[PDB]
Structure formats: structure tokens, C-alpha cells
């Protein structure tokens, strides 16, 4: 990947934003002052490996620094956002050089789960402790950490799971897994953190904040969970309740059942015999019927011209395109065999 | 060692003197003289109380033993070989009990020589309840504290402690560790106490306390210091007197011993024959206190003039002291040559 990352430093206590660079004799470029131009040292290796495994020739990711203040020298928090990965890192200084203390990472910030299936959010983390921690530790080793999972409700935070000595809260059947990669006494430690949500319903999609609590440190990553569901498409004719045949013009109803995203659903009518041809006649779409399982339904109505003898054996079809479907879409059809006297 | 232990269940509260009734500890023969509440069939899974009796010296007398209300029962077994403290939990008829905590020392009355290092050695065993293992994520032996205090009328004096060391007085060092760190079962551990260059002011009663979560174990030790004196005999006289007026008068010097009491000086005239305690006026000087706590002493004897028959014999002072063998120490000066002229 790239060895340099451009970025901007913002002041949270506003009421601005300065440029800066991050180097992962160096390349000079004197457009930055030695206060936002940081040369990173990642002995834990979680930060360098992220850009090493970065896709070849991918666009540059968004980034932002802030002045972190530990609470129950200086500290620079670096947040990096990209469709490839989302990362949070802590840096301590001493081009100004800095060392990476804590790093939280995820390589799937946009997980797309199918309705009714289990969702699996994955992150990892790495911690490099100062000498003060090992020197003061009776029987040294990896520190105890907390792992909390919240979902933003567009104006409200809702805690779902938390890896704990018993003060958790488990909602919607979610479970959290978290573990250091080893219990060695020294050195930086790396760990995995996963979040399992069962039988995901569309009321659970959105922003997921995953928080790592180190004794005096914080890390936060964001994920965008999206749900999709392919529709079930059917095509059947006739109209009304107790109406005589032909009283109303012949109608073709293409019904779509149980699809979630409820947008970009395009319905189309074709006639396949004599080669194919786009269907003729009046056409419109019904109103959405919202279900309880999150999904919705729709009806497309087509009034075609009378059935001519040349179209015997030919079939009418409704094709459908939707983001929860491939480029070919999904199709349903009815063949004019023993049912063409209705539409003629 | 013994297979059964006779004891006494003591009571207080009333303040009219210790009320006591018989009782025994069976490590089942019928005991009628003992009430069924005081006849305990002890169960020691940690094996500290039981092993102390299996390794007990053969033919040794029955050690003193008394239980007290801690229905928590606390067993205190005392003997010149061991001092033991055990806590029992309850659940003809025999009340069954289980040993939970046992703190034990095999040097209850250590005797150290002045200037040497003393080593107070204890051991302890802990049988946890199931509620402790059931609530331990990553389980194992619990962290404990081991404090050391020397008791004397005035104030409690904590000398050393196991690190929770925030003590360390008089150069003392504390040693404590579980025998292993296994997750389950009862655990055993040791607890040694080091005192460098023990001086007479460090004598007294030492209390060792085990600090377990919601538990307390205690034993007492009686550290005593001794110093064998140096004995010597020589002719001497008074200083602020008239020239030649004072009689000859021998001098027995008892140098550098600590236990000031119990030391007596005695005189003899070894050659009728050799058996002849010396005759004449005798007295004892004052105690000369040294910087190391030991004391010194002078013995005096004004014997009669030596005749030509006492030639070849010799005078001697026998020194007896608890820090000495039964024969004591003896120093003699000979009545031959220039000494016969002085005496």
C-alpha cells in the first residue's frame, strides 16, 4: 500500500482544521509544520499491516486527528475511515516522531446480512504498554479489557452486548466474543473481538459503535450494517370479486412478496413468443404493504391488448430489478394456454 | 503418633473462670464421659492436622488441646514440638466436622544464640468451600497476607508482612508462597520469618497471622536469646584503699552473657584431696551492660593464707547458668611460683 497518509487535525473544542501528514532522511514536503506531520512507529504491527494488506491501487482513505485526554505527555487520536477498513489509533510523541499505543481495526465496515440470518461483526486490536505498566506489575501479562457494542438509533445510543465480575447486558440475543491472542507476560498484545447477532431483522440495521475499554484508554470503531432480501415474484391474471369476464379489461398482476430494501424496485413487462418484445398496454404499480417481518410487498398491474391468434403459445412475463438481485433480475411468466379466452 | 486426641472444650462469657468439659478428636469407639456434641470425627482434606500427628514423635506425651467457639470450632493444640491452630465447620451420635484452615509451627519456642539469625518457620493449609470455586473465573489459590508481630505491653509491633512488603523492620524478611497454584482442591503453603543478628531487645512473643478472605489464622512463638559467658580467674585487689591493707582476694570474671538471672558463682579448692569448696568472704559485683545487650560480672573470694600443704593445689570458680551445660564452666589459677607468695 501507501507509505504516506494525508490527513487533517481538528480541534474538538471549537466555536478549525489544519493539514497534516502521517509517515508509516524522509520525504520532506515543507507544507506542514512539525506538530501535525507525524512519523509513526507501530511496534505492535497492527497499523503497518493494515496498509500492507491494503488493496493495490485503492483510493486514499479519509482520516482525522484529535487531542485525546485520558480520563476514568500529549496524545493524538487518529481515526481512519474507508470502504476497505475502519481504524482508530492512539499515538504518543516524545517531522515529529510518535509511537502507537492502542489500535482498533475492522476490515468489514459495511457488512451486508440477509434477512433472517446471523450477522457476524469482526474487529481486532493491539496494545503496546509503557514500561511503567510492566515495571509496576506483579506477575505481568495482558491487561483486562472491556468490549462494548452499541447501535445508534439516529439520536440515541443502545447497548447490545458487552464482554465482561458480572455487569453486562445482553439484548436481542446478541453475544460478544473477545480474547487476546496469547497470555505472554511481555511485549505488545493483539486480540480478536467479534459480535454475533441472531436472525437479523431490518430494525437492527444502521451504525454500530464498538468500544474497547483499556484501564485508562478508549478505542472506538464504526460499522454500517445493511440488510437485504430478494423478493418472491408471481404472475396471475383476472380481476375483481364477483365480476363477469370482460366487464373489466383483462388484467395481469405481478405480485412481489417479502423483500426488504423497499427501494429501486423496477417492474417490467415483456412478451416472449417470433423472438421477444417489450409488452404493450397500460401499466402501473400498487402501493407498498408494510409487513411485520420488516419486508414489504407490491403489485404491478398490466392491461394488455386483446390476445391475437399470432400470440398463441406466447407468454407474458414480468421482469424485476432490485439491489437485492443480480443484474439479470427475477422473472415470472404466464403462458397463453387454455387461459387466453379470458384476455380475448 | 497418637490415633485419638483428648481435649477440653472451654467456655468464657460468664467471667467466673474458664468452664470446661471433656472432649476428644477422632482422626468409632463409644465415649460416654464425653457429650456427643464434643466428640468430633474430624475430616481433614488438606491433611495438615492429620499429618502433624502421623509424623508425631513416637512415645511422645499427649499434647494439650482445647476447642473454643470461633458453630465454628477452633482447635488449639500446644506442645514443645508443635503449636497448631485449626478451624472446624459442622454440618452413639458423633458430630461430624471438617477442617477448613490449619496454621501450624514446629518451632514454638525457638532458642537463638545472640548475634545469629533466627528462622521462624510455619505452614498452613486451606480447604475452600464450593462457593469460592464456583465464583472464580480463572480459578486458583487465593491471595493471602502473612503478617509478623512481636508482642509486648505498649503497642502492637508489625515487623514484616507478605506483599498484598510494606513493612520490613529491623532488617527482617518475610517468605510465603503456596505449594502450587493448581485451580482446584485444598492448597498448602509455607511461611518463614528471618531475623538477622538477633539482639536481646528482639526477645518476646511473636504472633503470625494468615490473612485469607474472610478467614483468620494465628500461632504464637516464644523467641529466647542466650549467650554462654566466658570464664576466667586471676588475682586482683581494691583500688581506692590503703597500700597493702586489703587482703589478696581472687577475681572470677564472667564475660559477655545475656540472661542476667540464674547465674551463680561458686568456689572450690582442687588438690583430704581435691573436693574442697573454698572458704572465706565472697561477694558479687554489679552487671556491666554492653552495647549488644549482654552483661558481664566479677566474682571475688578472699581465701585464707595458703599453707605449705595446699602447695600444688589450685583455686577455681565454677559458673552455672541456664545457657550452660549441667557441669557449667570452670576456670582455675595455680598456686605455684609467684602465686604462692601472693596468697
Amino acid at each position, epitope marked *: 500500500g501507501p507509505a504516506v497518509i494525508e490527513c487533517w487535525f481538528v480541534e474538538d473544542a471549537s466555536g478549525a482544521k489544519r493539514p497534516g501528514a502521517l509517515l508509516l532522511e524522509p520525504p520532506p514536503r515543507p507544507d506542514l509544520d512539525p506538530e501535525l506531520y507525524l512519523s509513526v512507529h507501530d511496534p505492535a504491527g497492527a497499523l503497518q499491516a493494515a496498509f500492507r494488506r491494503y488493496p493495490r491501487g485503492a483510493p486514499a482513505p479519509h482520516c482525522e486527528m484529535s487531542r485525546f485526554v485520558p480520563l476514568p505527555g500529549a496524545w493524538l487520536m487518529v481515526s481512519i475511515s474507508s470502504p476497505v477498513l475502519s481504524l482508530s489509533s492512539l499515538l504518543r510523541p516524545q517531522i515529529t516522531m510518535a509511537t502507537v499505543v492502542l489500535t482498533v481495526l475492522t476490515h468489514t465496515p459495511a457488512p451486508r446480512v440477509r434477512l433472517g440470518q446471523d450477522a457476524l461483526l469482526d474487529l481486532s486490536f493491539a496494545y503496546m504498554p509503557p514500561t511503567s505498566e510492566a515495571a509496576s506489575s506483579l506477575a505481568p501479562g495482558p491487561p483486562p479489557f472491556g468490549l462494548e457494542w452499541r447501535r445508534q438509533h439516529l439520536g440515541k445510543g443502545h447497548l447490545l452486548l458487552a464482554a465482561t465480575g458480572q455487569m453486562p447486558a445482553a439484548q436481542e440475543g446478541a453475544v460478544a466474543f*473477545a480474547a487476546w491472542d496469547d*497470555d505472554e507476560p511481555w511485549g505488545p498484545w493483539t486480540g480478536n473481538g467479534t459480535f454475533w447477532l441472531p436472525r437479523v431483522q431490518p430494525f437492527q440495521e444502521g451504525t454500530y459503535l464498538a468500544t474497547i475499554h483499556l484501564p485508562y484508554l478508549q478505542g472506538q470503531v464504526t460499522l454500517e450494517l445493511a440488510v437485504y432480501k430478494p423478493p418472491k415474484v408471481s404472475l396471475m391474471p383476472a380481476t375483481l370479486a364477483r365480476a363477469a369476464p370482460g366487464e373489466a379489461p383483462p388484467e395481469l398482476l405481478c405480485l412481489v412478496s417479502h423483500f426488504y430494501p423497499s427501494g429501486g424496485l423496477e417492474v417490467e413487462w415483456e412478451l416472449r413468443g417470433g423472438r421477444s418484445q417489450k409488452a404493450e398496454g397500460q401499466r402501473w404499480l400498487s402501493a407498498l404493504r408494510h409487513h411485520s417481518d420488516g419486508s414489504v410487498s407490491l403489485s404491478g398491474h398490466l392491461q394488455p391488448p386483446p390476445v391475437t391468434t399470432e400470440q398463441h403459445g406466447a407468454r407474458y412475463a414480468c421482469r424485476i430489478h432490485h439491489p437485492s438481485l443480480p443484474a439479470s433480475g427475477r422473472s415470472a411468466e404466464v403462458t397463453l394456454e387454455g387461459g387466453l379466452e379470458v384476455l380475448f | 503418633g497418637p490415633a485419638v486426641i483428648e481435649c477440653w472444650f472451654v467456655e468464657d462469657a460468664s467471667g467466673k473462670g474458664l468452664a470446661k468439659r471433656p472432649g476428644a478428636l477422632l482422626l468409632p469407639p463409644p465415649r460416654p464421659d464425653l457429650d456427643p456434641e464434643l466428640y468430633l470425627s474430624v475430616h481433614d482434606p488438606a491433611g495438615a492436622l492429620q499429618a502433624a500427628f502421623r509424623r508425631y514423635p513416637r512415645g511422645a506425651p499427649a499434647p494439650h488441646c482445647e476447642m473454643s467457639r470461633f458453630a465454628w470450632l477452633m482447635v488449639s493444640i500446644s506442645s514443645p514440638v508443635l503449636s497448631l491452630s485449626s478451624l472446624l465447620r459442622p454440618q452413639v451420635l458423633i458430630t461430624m466436622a471438617t477442617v477448613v484452615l490449619t496454621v501450624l509451627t514446629h518451632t514454638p519456642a525457638p532458642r537463638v544464640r545472640l548475634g545469629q539469625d533466627a528462622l521462624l518457620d510455619l505452614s498452613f493449609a486451606y480447604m475452600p468451600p464450593t462457593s469460592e470455586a464456583a465464583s472464580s473465573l480463572a480459578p486458583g489459590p487465593p491471595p493471602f497476607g502473612l503478617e509478623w508481630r512481636r508482642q509486648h505491653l505498649g503497642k502492637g509491633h508489625l515487623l514484616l508482612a507478605a506483599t498484598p512488603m510494606p513493612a520490613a523492620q529491623e532488617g527482617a524478611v518475610a517468605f510465603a508462597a503456596w505449594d502450587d497454584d493448581e485451580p*482446584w482442591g485444598p492448597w498448602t503453603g509455607n511461611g518463614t520469618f528471618w531475623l538477622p543478628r538477633v539482639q536481646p531487645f528482639q526477645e518476646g512473643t511473636y504472633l503470625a497471622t494468615i490473612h485469607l478472605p474472610y478467614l483468620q489464622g494465628q500461632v504464637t512463638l516464644e523467641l529466647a536469646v542466650y549467650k554462654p559467658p566466658k570464664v576466667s580467674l586471676m588475682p586482683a585487689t581494691l583500688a581506692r584503699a590503703a597500700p597493702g591493707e586489703a587482703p589478696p582476694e581472687l577475681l572470677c570474671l564472667v564475660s559477655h552473657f545475656y540472661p542476667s538471672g540464674g547465674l551463680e558463682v561458686e568456689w572450690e579448692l582442687r588438690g583430704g584431696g581435691r573436693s574442697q569448696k573454698a572458704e572465706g568472704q565472697r561477694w558479687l559485683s554489679a552487671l556491666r551492660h554492653h552495647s549488644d545487650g549482654s552483661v558481664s560480672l566479677s566474682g571475688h573470694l578472699q581465701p585464707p593464707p595458703v599453707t605449705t600443704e595446699q602447695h600444688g593445689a589450685r583455686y577455681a570458680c565454677r559458673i552455672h547458668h541456664p545457657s550452660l551445660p549441667a557441669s557449667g564452666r570452670s576456670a582455675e589459677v595455680t598456686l605455684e611460683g609467684g602465686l604462692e607468695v601472693l596468697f
Partner: antibody
Amino acid sequence: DVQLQESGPGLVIPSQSLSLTCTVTGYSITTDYAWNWIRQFPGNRLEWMGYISSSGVTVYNPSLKSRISITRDTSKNQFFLQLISVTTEDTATYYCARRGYYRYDSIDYWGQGTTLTVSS
Amino acid sequence: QIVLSQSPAILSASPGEKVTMTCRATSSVSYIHWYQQKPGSSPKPWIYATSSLTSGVPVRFSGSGSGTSYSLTISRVEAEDAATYYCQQWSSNPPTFGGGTKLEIKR
């Protein structure tokens, strides 16, 4: 009689999560005796996984901590095993079992065992 | 992680010989427990606390050992004893088992 009964599907798709269940009768899982999960791979290699400890408190094998979750149902005297993102290396015979809290205590009661394979 | 190793792996015996398998631990261990497993069934608790037979086990079985080396002995083997025996410890955080020792009967 304190018996144990494993209950599982027997088949799971790779990268999915399995859920096993152990129903014990003649004894309450809230009095004593840690309740464990042990699996035996093809080739007869036992491996302890973890336990729930009669009062909650899960203890896991360090090699599986990032992938294992054990819970219990007090009202039904059941406890469960959950493994996440399974692979072909996870197919084995899974046993639930009882174990006391002391060093002389053995795994005194085992279940009948359920076979579980992972394939398409 | 304490590793247990069972030496005989497989051992043959005619109905009537005295046999012994061993379980050697990498570290000191207070107690090692044994389990008899026949094919198709769960392992049965055979002896606990190194040398204590579980109720129902014939008295012709016996366990011994200490610290780092242990053993299991059958005074006279029996056709009904054809199975694999596993030794297990719980002195460290992850309790482990041995690779097993199958007892094949000669006939």
C-alpha cells in the same frame, strides 16, 4: 441418578454457528459441580472446551476463548454450548460432563454424546 | 499447557496376564484420573485420585504414581477389558488428556 443428555442438530454449514444443549436430570445445575463441554475428534483426541460454574462464571480453554460461549437455563436445568464460525476442523463428538471443584474430583458423569459434522 | 503422554499406545495380552500402561506428565501433577472408553460410547470414569476405583470397576484394576509419572495396572486381563484408556489431569488452566492406550486382546 444425575444423567446428562446432549441435544444437537448433527450438521452445520461452514462459517455458521452451532448450538448444542445439555439437559441434566436428577440434579440441579445450580447447587454444585462445574458443568463442562468436551469433544473428541476423529482419531480419538479429547479436548476440554469450557464450563459454566453452577453460579454463572464461564471458564474457557485459552485456544477457544475468541470463539466459544457457554450459557445455562436455570428454569429448565439446561446449559448450552455455542461455537462461532466453525470449520472442517470442528467436526467431532461433543460431550457435556460434570466435574467437582476439588483436585481429587474427576469428571464423574458424562453424556451420551452427539455426533456433529461440518460440510456443504 | 501440561502435556500427557501414554507409552504403550497399543498393548496385546492373553486373558490372564498382568499388564501396565503409563502416563507421564510434563510437569508435576497432584492427581491423574483414568477413563475407559469402548468404541461408540462415552468414556467411563474408571479411577479418580490416582488410585481410587470408581464404583462398579472390578478390583483387578489399580492405579499408582506420583508427581510426574503415573500408571494403571490390570492384575489379570479380561476379554471385557478390550478398550482404550485415557489419563487426564487438571493441575493447569486447560485440563488435558493423553493420546490413549488401546488394550488389544490376544486369542
